Structures are given as structure tokens and as C-alpha cells.
Write a protein that binds this ligand. Structure first.
Ligand SMILES: Nc1ncnc2c1ncn2[C@H]1C[C@H](O)[C@@H](COP(=O)(O)OP(=O)(O)OP(=O)(O)O)O1
Ligand SMILES: [Ca+2]
Ligand SMILES: [Ca+2]
Ligand SMILES: [Ca+2]
Ligand SMILES: [Ca+2]
Ligand SMILES: [Ca+2]
Length: 901
DNA sequence: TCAGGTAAGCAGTCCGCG
DNA sequence: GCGGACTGCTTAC
């Protein structure tokens, strides 16, 4: 087999690499890598190395990496560019793996671990590590085993061994319900003292050294805690055994308002699953506790126990250990679904970076572009310092607030990357500038044609047309991968709808789910069998379809994020190829494209309707348009349609056969106007939206920019079994809105769009009447909490104190002296509730850590003093008032002359 | 919130507005 | 009471 790296490090003048050799075995080597860097040289000097602009370079081979680094410094001292890859391990990987890497995940050791630490004096600070580690569960992907290290004897209590038999029993049997499918995979090791636990753990670690290390909050908690605890007990050298090269560094993580410390373990790639989730999931959650995320992703109930976590080991060690094991399993279950580890490995090996670098698009692209250029003996420029400067972004159309009955939407496929490819935007393809006219002049095609030679953007930039830039070349490759995965995602989605339809008529039989590949549209034969399956088999198929769709979503949206990151990287001062000429070339072209095509679509539709000056495009944002289809529907007449699906077909056909050809013609003209290299503006139909046929539903509404709701029947070719709301920006979509309020507001919107005014008024009256019974957590607002210290003045709100920060200070006074009460963590999220006049907390709100119940010693007082009226008005009524006035509707029935009877 | 761009919405504070 | 200047937070792209 072809070899592949596992990890790579520079330690002094040595490269330390762990790798899989040609026989599939893990090996480690130290290599005295001699790096090369480059300097510009005279034309008369024969060379095969050229910078990206075609200027000749001489290669400078160094005795060692430190010599190379010192040379860079001296070149700065002289004032001359020092060219080439200055991150020497990336150059080492490029030299060592000079081919597309084919990796085998089954040979990569993926460790997932979680530790427990009993602490009677509050949160166990990792940097102090003053409390014993009393449990470690460590799952190894190669062994497929959960290794459990259990401390029986502690200063905080002596306990009995954990029982696997009790662990397997139902909660209703007094057991822990450790899933039966992992029971046989547990390797349980009890220890009489902490020193032997940790020594054995380190020996185990040497034997089974993680390549990828993950878990929940492992980078901020588990790793620093284990490292510091071992350091405290045994000394530094023993703690450094966590690194296979015995090298570690305390790394200071700085944010806007403070810093924290993590431990870098050389020769290990730490991918904390919380950070994987935050980057790759495209959610924003009210809380990031594992119990909250597990419930969200897997629909598993919260791990329940009595009393504080600090007394759980002494009161119920059995449950203590079981929940440690389950917590490790939950992360593995999330990953089986979301496949973020597989994503990281894919992207990492593609770019030829340290796997943990997938968190940085700048580093990822720097390595992709470097490897690409290196193949052509081209030499990358030196990174430079740039002051951060603002620059212009997308255009967003100001919509007229209103109901909109029938709507078809269209938007560009991979807009910014397609602009890059079309215009040929790259560092080395810059050809010059042209004198710019107002943007309006290009939009309306009255401005002079920018160039008869070069490919142009309306920001004034011109680009070569003879060859593709390295940015268009490399972005195309990742775009093509994205497209393949999106194909699989959409097929799984369509397949899902086939199953949902069949579930309307399940068969009374005993059978199995069909063995099918959900990434491909079901054949006629599969469809026929599905129509004969039981509800049990259908639901199992639906679950598998949806898992396939999730896998496709992960693969596609994060490849989309990567290529969109390259467009963004051109406006990031840390990027090697930072250039505001190129960043603005993209964004300004985007602004032109949207407004150009708005004009074109308006012109086309006024023509087919025999009108003049009417606006069919009601809205657009960045690369999208929303077209009113009322007149198209009315041209055939609603009476002519058999059912909803009938007019959806008609609009689908109209969009595909009339709109899209018109749109394509408009963009082809724009391509030629800008003299672009290749037409790649593909604005495909997204949504077909409208009320159910014969209903009083309003179909859709806008309140303003980035705030709208549509009742959608077909989305990018997926015809829904049931209509689905596309809601953007409104309070139902914000993590700050109370959960129960999101639900109620969503139902209000559903009723508005599908059923009409009367239905809405019915639901509002009921929600208003019953909402005080809602659980306090379900009606609490949510906010991130930054700068708590800034606004704290002797425990009281300072000037300009934010409402949520005020809440935290109220909490802090109410729990003062309690070393045990949960502390609000700076930068994390809190629930927030308003408090009625004259409450014992002495202020208008209280806040507490999100994802948790408020501590018992104030809970009853919070509940008693909760201001339900203020809560209702702020989170429910005011947004609803916004929705209904926009839609020209009333949420409360107006008096009429019929009331006289 | 270490990690990737800008546009733009709403909550809330402070304070003006005769 | 609303709105403008401003901060904070959170979305849509
Ligand atoms: N998370 C992001 N980071 C940077 N730029 C973004 C992001 N989301 C959107 N953009 C910019 C770049 C996109 O090309 C452009 C249009 O957004 P959007 O329509 O959501 O994606 P897209 O056009 O790239 O892909 P799709 O093919 O799924 O529509 O807005
Ligand atoms: Ca725990
Ligand atoms: Ca798009
Ligand atoms: Ca059937
Ligand atoms: Ca879009
Ligand atoms: Ca599309």
C-alpha cells in the first residue's frame, strides 16, 4: 500500500513523523530535514524555479531548519523577499508525499476519552489540578474497546468496584442502561490508588498512542487536567509521556477579553469534538453541554442523577462510572451520525497539513496552493504584514414589507467561487486596471466595455485570459468534490420523501428494510417494494435515508465552507495571498450580478405579461432573487388546477423552461460585457412557495432585509410529502429566543402561511391563555455572556450594563459565599429571565448557566418572581406584532357590525 | 469566543425631544 | 414614547 503520515512535528532541526508504512504498520522516524527557500536572481542565471509572476529564483539549500529560519530574519534585516514555504513541516510533507494521499482510516488510532474529578470546592481548574482523577474512560478505535480506569480509594471516599451487570440493567431495574451493544467492549480496571491508576494509564498510552485525540472539551479540560495532575504527582518528564516525542508546550489561547491555557502534545492531533461540532455542524446552540447536544443530535434522554456532581461518586459510584462510559459513547454516536472525524481526515490529507489545521482555512489553503504551485516548480511569495482594512461586501435589496402569495426563488451555485473561476481571480493573473464607472452604469449596461483583452470585474480589476490562476484551478477541484457530495445529499433527501409518502399506507406484514444505497435515487423496482413494506421497515429505511442525507450534508456544506473560505481569505491579513483588489473584485462583481439579473428578470416578465415598469423581483440577498409568481398563476387561473401539486408542477416547469433560459441568456451577456474567461453564473431555481390550493393561507411574507417566511412545496428538486416552512432571520431561527416561544411563533407562522388570519387568531388566544404553565427553562431567553467583569461595580451593574450581564450579577449576589453553586463562565451562554417589581433579588432580571437547572437554593424564588407578562410581551407578542403588520394581518380579532347580534 | 469574509437585523442603555 | 448613537449579540449570505 501507499504510505501516509499520521502526525508531523518540527522539533529543533529534526522532523518527527509518525506514519503508516508500505505494509500498513505504524512507525516513527526522526529526519534531519534540510529545507529549501528561495531568493530572486538575475535573468542571466539559469534556473527552473520561478515565482508566481514569472521572475526567476535561485534555490537555497540549508544545512538545517534553524539556518533557514535565521536566513529569513536576515533577509528582513536587508529588506529583501525570502520566498518559499516557511512552515518547514508542510514542505517536508510535500517532499515526502508527492502524490495524492490515499489513507486507510482503519490504521489510524482514534482515541476518545473523558475523565472524572471529584471536587468539593467548586470547579476543578485544570491549571491547578489539585483534586484526584477518579475515573478515565478511553475508547480506542483500533481495538474498538472502552478502557475504564476506576479509582476505588480517594481522600474523597473509598468505594466498591463498578458492576457491569448492574450497568447493563434498565434504569427501571435500578441499573444504568449502558447500551447493550457496548457492554462486551468494556475493559474495566479498578485501582487501589491514584498513582497506580495514572502510571498504568501512561503505560497503556505508550502502547496505544492516540493519533487523533478527541472527546468533549478535552482540549480545555481533560488534556490540561491529566497533564497537570501527573506533573504535580510525578514531575514534568512523566507528564510529557503524553507526547510520543516527549515534547509539550503550554499554549496561550488569547481572545478579545482575556486568555486561557491549553497543552500542545507534539506528535498528537487533538480534535476536540466540541470545536469540531461548532465549526462543522452549522447550528448555533443554546448550550454546549454534552447532554444538551446528545439530546439534540440523537434524541437520547439526559443522564439523570440525584444530588450535585461533587457528591455523585460517594453516593453512587456505580452510576458515576456508568455515566463516564456513556459520555464517551455519546461522542462516538454523534460522530457516527455527523462524521466530522472522517471530514477532518479527508480535508487534512487533501491539503497535506497536520490534521488539526482543518480548523484554519488560511493554513488549509496555504498548503493546497503551495503543493499545487510546487508541482510546476513555482515558488510561493513571502507572507507580509497588512493593516486590517474594511472592504465592501454583498448587495441586499430592501423589500417592501408585505404578504407575498406565490414566490419562486433562484440563486447562484457556489456564487463567490464561481465568480473567482469566471473572472479568473488569482494573485498571479492580475493584468491591470481600468477606469471604473458608477456600479449603476454596469448594472444597466450603459458603461463603456471595460476591456477587449482581459477578464474584468466592475471594481476596476482586469485579469489574464490565457491560463487559469492557481486560485481558480484549486477552488474548482474542491468545488467538484462539493458538487458530488451535494448530489448524494439531495438524492437521499428525495429518497426520504418517497418513504414518507409510502408511510401513509403501511402494510400489515412482517418484513425487513431493503438493502439499498440511499445516495442514489430509488429505481422503479425499489419504489414498488417500498409500497409493500410495513411501517416498521419503512421507518427504519427513513432513519437510514436521513442518516445518509446527514453524511452528504456534512461532506458538501463543509466543502462549500472551505471554498467560500478562500474567497474570504483574500480579505484576511494573515493569508499569504491577501489582496483587497481581489477580495473586492469578487464582492463587487457579485453586487453587479444580482442587480443585473434583477433587471433582466424584470424585463423578461414584463414582456411575457404585456406590462411595463412592474417589479416581479421582490427581494434578493447577495446572489439570490425572489420572484412574485402571482401573475403567472392568475394567467391560467386558480380554477384550472386540480390540487396544490398541480400548480407546483406548472411553476416548476415555468421556472425550468422559461425563467432559467432567460436568466442564462442575461448572464451570458454579462459575461461578454465583462469579457470574462468562462460563463459560470448558474442561477438555479431554489424554492416554489405558495398557500395550499383553496385555503386562506397567505403563502409568505417579508418584514425587511434578512427576515421572511415561505411555505415551500419544492426545494431544489425535492418535492415534499408535506409543505415545509423556509423561515430566515425571524425569532424562530434565533438561539436567543426561548424554546417554547420559537415553537409557538413557528406555529403562528404556519397558520398564517397555510390557513390564514382566523386560524392565527385562534392559536394566539390559546397560547396567551396557557403560557404561564410552561417550564421556566422553555421560556427563558438565551445569550452569550462576554465582559462580565467590565460591567461589575462592587457586585452591581456599571454604566451601559447589558441586560443579560445585569442578570448574571443578580445571580452572583444571590449565590455569594457558595463555593458549590455553579459559576457563570465568561464567554459561555446563560438563560435569562425577567423578575417582577419588588423581588428579593433586588433587580429586574436573573441569569444562570444555560443547559442547566438553576441551583435549588434560589430556584423556588426565581419561579415565584418570574415576570410572565414582560416575558410574553418581549419574546412573543412584539415579534408576532412585527410578523402580522408586515403581512397586513391581525393576531387579535377586530370588532365588527356582526357583534350587534 | 484560536480558527474564515461583509451586511444587517433586534434588544437594550442612555438621553434627547420644548 | 420614539429615535439616534452606541454596544452586544446573532443571523443571512
Ligand atoms: N459562511 C460563509 N463564509 C464566507 N462567505 C459566505 C458564507 N456563506 C455565504 N457566503 C458568501 C459566499 C457565497 O458563495 C455567497 C452566497 O451564499 P450561499 O448562497 O449561502 O452559498 P453558495 O452560493 O456558495 O452555495 P450554494 O451553491 O449552496 O448556494 O455568500
Ligand atoms: Ca462527567
Ligand atoms: Ca447560492
Ligand atoms: Ca403500502
Ligand atoms: Ca443564496
Ligand atoms: Ca441551487
Amino acid at each position: 500500500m501507499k504510505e501516509f503520515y499520521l502526525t508531523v512535528e518540527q522539533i529543533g532541526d529534526s522532523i518527527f513523523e509518525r506514519y503508516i508504512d508500505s505494509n500498513g504498520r505504524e512507525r516513527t522516524r526522526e529526519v534531519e530535514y534540510k529545507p529549501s527557500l528561495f531568493a530572486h536572481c538575475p535573468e542571466s542565471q539559469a534556473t527552473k524555479y520561478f515565482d508566481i509572476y514569472g521572475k526567476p529564483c535561485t534555490r537555497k539549500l540549508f544545512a538545517n531548519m534553524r539556518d533557514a529560519s535565521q536566513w529569513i530574519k536576515r533577509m528582513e534585516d536587508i529588506g529583501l523577499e525570502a520566498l518559499g514555504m516557511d512552515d518547514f513541516k508542510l514542505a517536508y510533507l510535500s517532499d515526502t508525499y508527492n502524490y495524492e494521499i490515499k489513507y486507510d482510516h482503519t490504521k489510524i488510532r482514534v482515541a476518545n476519552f473523558d475523565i472524572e474529578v471529584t471536587s468539593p470546592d467548586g470547579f476543578p481548574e485544570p491549571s491547578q489540578a489539585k483534586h484526584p482523577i477518579d475515573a478515565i474512560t478511553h475508547y480506542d478505535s483500533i481495538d474498538d474497546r472502552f478502557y475504564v480506569f476506576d479509582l476505588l480509594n480517594s481522600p474523597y471516599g473509598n468505594v466498591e468496584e463498578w458492576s457491569i451487570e448492574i450497568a447493563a440493567k434498565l434504569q427501571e431495574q435500578g441499573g444504568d442502561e449502558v447500551p447493550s451493544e457496548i457492554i462486551d467492549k468494556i475493559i474495566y480496571m479498578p485501582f487501589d490508588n491514584e498513582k497506580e491508576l495514572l502510571m498504568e494509564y501512561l503505560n497503556f498510552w505508550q502502547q496505544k498512542t492516540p493519533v487523533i485525540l478527541t472527546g468533549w472539551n478535552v482540549e480545555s479540560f481533560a488534556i490540561p487536567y491529566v497533564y497537570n495532575r501527573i506533573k504535580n504527582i510525578f514531575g514534568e518528564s512523566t507528564a510529557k509521556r503524553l507526547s510520543p516525542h516527549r515534547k509539550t508546550r503550554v499554549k496561550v489561547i488569547e481572545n478579545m477579553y482575556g486568555s486561557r491555557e491549553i497543552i500542545t502534545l507534539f506528535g498528537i492531533s487533538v480534535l476536540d469534538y466540541i470545536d469540531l461540532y461548532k465549526k462543522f455542524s452549522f447550528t448555533n446552540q443554546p448550550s454546549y453541554s454534552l447532554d444538551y447536544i446528545s439530546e439534540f443530535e440523537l434524541n437520547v434522554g439526559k443522564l439523570k442523577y440525584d444530588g450535585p456532581i461533587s457528591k455523585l461518586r460517594e453516593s453512587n459510584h456505580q452510576r458515576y462510572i456508568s455515566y463516564n462510559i456513556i459520555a464517551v459513547y455519546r461522542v462516538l454516536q454523534i460522530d457516527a451520525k455527523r462524521q466530522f472525524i472522517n471530514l477532518s481526515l479527508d480535508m487534512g490529507y487533501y491539503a497535506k497539513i497536520q490534521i488539526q489545521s482543518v480548523f484554519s482555512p488560511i493554513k488549509t489553503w496555504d498548503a493546497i496552493i503551495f503543493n499545487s504551485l510546487k508541482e510546476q516548480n513555482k515558488v510561493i511569495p513571502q507572507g507580509r504584514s497588512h493593516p486590517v482594512q474594511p472592504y465592501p461586501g454583498a448587495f441586499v435589496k430592501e423589500p417592501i414589507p408585505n404578504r407575498y402569495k406565490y414566490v419562486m426563488s433562484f440563486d447562484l451555485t457556489s456564487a463567490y467561487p464561481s465568480i473567482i473561476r469566471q473572472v479568473n481571480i488569482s494573485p498571479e493573473t492580475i493584468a491591470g486596471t481600468f477606469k471604473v464607472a458608477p456600479l449603476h452604469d454596469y448594472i444597466n449596461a450603459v458603461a463603456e466595455r471595460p476591456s477587449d483583452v482581459y477578464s474584468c470585474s466592475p471594481n476596476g480589476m482586469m485579469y489574464y485570459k490565457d491560463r487559469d490562476g492557481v486560485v481558480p484551478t484549486e477552488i474548482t477541484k474542491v468545488f467538484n468534490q462539493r458538487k458530488e457530495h451535494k448530489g448524494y445529499m439531495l438524492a437521499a433527501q428525495r429518497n426520504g420523501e418517497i418513504i414518507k409518502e409510502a408511510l401513509h399506507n403501511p402494510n400489515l406484514s412482517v418484513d425487513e428494510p431493503l438493502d439499498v444505497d440511499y445516495r442514489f435515487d430509488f429505481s422503479d423496482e425499489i419504489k414498488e417494494k417500498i409500497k409493500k413494506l410495513s411501517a416498521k421497515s419503512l421507518n427504519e429505511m427513513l432513519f437510514r435515508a436521513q442518516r445518509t442525507e446527514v453524511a452528504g450534508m456534512t461532506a458538501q456544506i463543509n466543502r462549500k465552507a472551505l471554498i467560500n473560505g478562500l474567497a474570504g481569505a483574500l480579505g484576511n491579513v494573515w493569508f499569504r495571498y491577501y489582496d483587497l483588489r481581489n477580495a473586492t473584485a469578487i464582492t463587487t462583481f457579485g453586487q453587479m450580478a444580482l442587480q443585473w439579473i434583477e433587471r433582466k428578470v424584470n424585463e423578461y416578465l414584463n414582456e411575457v405579461c404585456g406590462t411595463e415598469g412592474e417589479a416581479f423581483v421582490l427581494y434578493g440577498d447577495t446572489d439570490s432573487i425572489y420572484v412574485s409568481a402571482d401573475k403567472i398563476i392568475d394567467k391560467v387561473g386558480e380554477s384550472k388546477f386540480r390540487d396544490t401539486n398541480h400548480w407546483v408542477d406548472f411553476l416548476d416547469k415555468f421556472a425550468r423552461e422559461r425563467m432559467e433560459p432567460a436568466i442564462d441568456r442575461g448572464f451570458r451577456e454579462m459575461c461578454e460585457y465583462m469579457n470574462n474567461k468562462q460563463h459560470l453564473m448558474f442561477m438555479d431555481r431554489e424554492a416554489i412557495a405558495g398557500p395550499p390550493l383553496g385555503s386562506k393561507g397567505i403563502g409568505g411574507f417579508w418584514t425587511g432585509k434578512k427576515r421572511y417566511a415561505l411555505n415551500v412545496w419544492d426545494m431544489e428538486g425535492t418535492r415534499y410529502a408535506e409543505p415545509k416552512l423556509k423561515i430566515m432571520g425571524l425569532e424562530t431561527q434565533k438561539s436567543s429566543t426561548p424554546k417554547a416561544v420559537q415553537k409557538a411563533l413557528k406555529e403562528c407562522i404556519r397558520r398564517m402561511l397555510q390557513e390564514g388570519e382566523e386560524s392565527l387568531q385562534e392559536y394566539f388566544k390559546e397560547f396567551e391563555k396557557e403560557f404561564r404553565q410552561l417550564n421556566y427553562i422553555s421560556i427563558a431567553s438565551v445569550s452569550s455572556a462576554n465582559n462580565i467583569a467590565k460591567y461589575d461595580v462592587g457586585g452591581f451593574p456599571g454604566p451601559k450594563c447589558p441586560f443579560h450581564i445585569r442578570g448574571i450579577l443578580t445571580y452572583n449576589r444571590a449565590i455569594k459565599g457558595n463555593i458549590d453553586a455553579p459559576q457563570v463562565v465568561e464567554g459561555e451562554k446563560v438563560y435569562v429571565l425577567p423578575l417582577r417589581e419588588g423581588n428579593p433579588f433586588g433587580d429586574k432580571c436573573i441569569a444562570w448557566p444555560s443547559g442547566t437547572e438553576i441551583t435549588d437554593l434560589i430556584k423556588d424564588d426565581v419561579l415565584h418572581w418570574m415576570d410572565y407578562t414582560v416575558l410574553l410581551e418581549k419574546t412573543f407578542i412584539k415579534p408576532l406584532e412585527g410578523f402580522t403588520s408586515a403581512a397586513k394581518l391581525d393576531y387579535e380579532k377586530k370588532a365588527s357590525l356582526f357583534d350587534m347580534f
